[PDB]
């Protein structure tokens, strides 16, 4: 029945109100990224054998990330 009455908790309220979360977001450029202190350490065979190009990865590496749902984004 409403836009606000679809992505919120209540749905049987047909009065089109706007909660404070509904704020316009413009595509901005002021953002910094974090260069990790550890990478995957991929080693290429560097021999270029006649039976293919070899790429190897053995050491595992993990990290955790928060998931903002209303933005549907992982940080």
């Amino acid at each position: 029945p409403l836009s606000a009455g679809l992505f919120k908790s209540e749905h049987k309220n047909p009065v089109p109100q706007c909660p404070p979360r509904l704020h316009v977001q413009f595509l901005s450029h002021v953002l910094w990224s974090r260069m990790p202190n550890q990478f995957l350490k991929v080693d290429v065979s560097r021999i270029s054998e006649r039976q293919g190009w070899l790429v190897q990865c053995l050491d595992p590496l993990q990290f955790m990330s928060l998931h903002i749902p209303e933005e549907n984004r992982s940080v």
Binding site: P1, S3, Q25
Partner: protein
């Protein structure tokens, strides 16, 4: 056995490439033809391979995907933006009227080109025979110019025409200034004795370039000959022949008398007292700035242009603040610069390869009487195709000009008393969405409340296009999958009804006029309704619902897409 699916209807703009993504515990082998590998199955008809896709006379290696995703120490070559390879048609000659004043010169040069066409074949040992052959060392196009018919003279004629037309197109003015054969006597004059100027040498080079361009444009209809690349992308061995073939034209003419990337450290590493010194190496001499900024610096504004950074640029030898002042000297390829900041005295100094920089007033000091604020963090900025390297300390064995300066005046490395490396934050490229701040110029948003509305406003002199978007997106269940855009009348728009399980975020892309009061209103008729109420000058503003999409440009179409089968 092939799979039963494919991604038809996808955007073909861009340079496609094969890619493999893996997490851990994997041993993968690409398979091509030739010395790179061996195919296990046979390719379908027509499909070539990458070892043939590689450009001629250029190597083939394997990067990761974009950048320096290498497990390396501080000796990582940080790169800024780059160009589109500078390469991702011949010159127009036919659109000029040929002056009949030198049509006789054109015919003389055509006769000379024909007689040299005879000459070189006879040097190989070709006689004049009635059969058009190449292995029988004979040619029926060696007879006098006058007895040459129209089916054999047009070649040299058009050659002379296009030579002089290319000359006029380049801009130089054209005007007034033995082995016994089998019947023909080609011997115009001694035309290989006087020097040719380098200008005319490059002229003949450009003539050969144009000729090879037209020849390649003719040859692209054939398969995949290695000579289908333009003349500048051609091997240096056969260029001289095409250059000599065109040099004699001007020989006769003369003889006859006729987005920068910013990098910094973590904001928590700011300093408020002491002497801090760090090195910045640059293997290039392009656009590169280095200095100390406050933990409020903009990742998109130019480094130093505001009161949040104090930098120095060697590309112009200028210290950078709110304004630019000529300071120090420029650097070259493969140089270093040590930056030192004393907070007890508010003193900034820079040494290019151990040589302290001087200002115009004869003072080694760069910056002076500045606020301590909240701290000063090292910062660098690189331009297009500019790579560099930073050193915050912790490696005194690798620091070169620390003993030359800094070691005695109580100056300390930025990361000497550290047990782990610095985070080394950077400026990201993908422009994600952010909420409109109150202290933002040229863009203001209000909110009132009958019905509830969020109106807009602006006060600016330069116009652009925005990408306004709502915060909370509407999610679609497994059954529901339809979206209809109804104008002031009825529902007339593109059939956008495909979403098995997605989350669409309402948005409008509006151009900035002098007065922009177009806004969004959550209204109601029978279901969820968002009305993007526009105003005057509504011809390029769009309004739709979009998932996560990060692209900043000015286009109504050319959007990414793909239909999976």
């Amino acid at each position: 056995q092939p799979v039963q699916g494919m991604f038809e209807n996808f955007n073909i703009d861009g340079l496609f490439f094969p890619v493999v993504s893996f997490s851990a515990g994997i041993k993968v082998r690409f398979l091509l033809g030739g010395r790179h590998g061996e195919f296990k199955f046979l390719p379908p008809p027509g499909y070539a391979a990458c070892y043939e896709a590689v450009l001629p006379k250029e190597k083939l290696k394997v990067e990761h995907s974009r950048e320096y995703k290498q497990e390396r120490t501080y000796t990582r070559d940080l790169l800024g933006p780059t160009v589109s390879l500078t390469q991702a048609v011949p010159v127009d000659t036919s659109q000029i009227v040929l002056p009949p004043h030198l049509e006789r010169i054109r015919e003389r040069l055509a006769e000379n080109i024909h007689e040299l066409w005879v000459m070189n074949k006879i040097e190989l040992g070709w006689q004049y025979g009635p059969v058009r052959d190449d292995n029988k060392r004979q040619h029926p196009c060696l007879v006098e110019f006058c007895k040459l018919p129209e089916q054999e003279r047009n070649y040299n004629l058009q050659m002379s025409l296009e030579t002089l037309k290319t000359l006029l197109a380049l801009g130089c003015h054209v005007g007034i200034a033995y082995q016994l054969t089998s019947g023909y006597k080609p011997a115009p004059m001694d035309l290989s004795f006087i020097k040719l100027t380098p200008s005319q040498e490059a002229m003949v080079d450009k003539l050969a370039e144009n000729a090879h361009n037209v020849w390649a444009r003719d040859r692209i209809r054939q398969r995949r000959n290695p000579r289908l690349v333009p003349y500048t992308l051609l091997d240096d061995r056969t260029k001289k022949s095409n250059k000599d073939s065109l040099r004699e034209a001007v020989r006769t003419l003369l003889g006859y008398g006729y987005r920068f990337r910013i990098f910094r450290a973590e904001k928590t590493y700011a300093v408020k007292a002491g002497r801090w010194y760090f090195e910045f190496e640059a293997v290039t001499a392009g656009d590169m700035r280095v200095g100390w900024s406050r933990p409020g610096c903009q990742p998109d504004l130019e480094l130093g242009s505001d009161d949040r950074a104090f930098a120095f640029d060697g590309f112009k030898a200028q210290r950078w603040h709110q304004g630019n002042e000529h300071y120090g000297r420029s650097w070259q390829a493969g140089d270093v610069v040590g930056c030192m900041v004393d907070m007890n005295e508010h003193t900034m100094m820079f040494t290019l390869n151990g040589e302290i920089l001087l200002d115009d007033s004869g003072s080694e000091l760069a910056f002076k009487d500045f606020d301590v604020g909240d701290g000063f963090i090292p910062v660098c900025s690189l331009g297009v195709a500019q790579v560099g390297r930073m050193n915050f300390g912790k490696d005194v064995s690798t620091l070169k000009y620390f003993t030359i300066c800094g070691l005695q005046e109580g100056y300390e490395p930025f990361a000497v008393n550290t047990n782990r490396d610095i985070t080394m934050w950077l400026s990201k490229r993908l422009p994600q969405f952010l909420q409109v701040p109150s202290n933002h110029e040229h863009i203001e948003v209000t909110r009132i409340d009958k019905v509830t509305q969020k109106s807009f406003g602006s006060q600016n002199n330069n116009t652009d296009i925005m990408f306004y978007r709502l915060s909370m997106p509407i999610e679609c269940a497994x059954x529901x999958x339809x979206x209809x855009x109804x104008x002031x009348x009825x529902x007339x728009x593109x059939x956008x009804x495909x979403x098995x399980x997605x989350x669409x975020x309402d948005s409008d892309f509006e151009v900035l006029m002098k007065t922009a009061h177009g806004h969004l209103v959550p209204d109601r008729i029978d279901k969820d309704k968002e009305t993007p109420k526009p105003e005057f000058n509504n011809h390029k503003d769009y309004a739709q619902e979009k998932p996560s999409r990060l692209k900043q440009x000015x286009x109504x179409x050319x959007x990414x897409x793909x239909x999976x089968x």
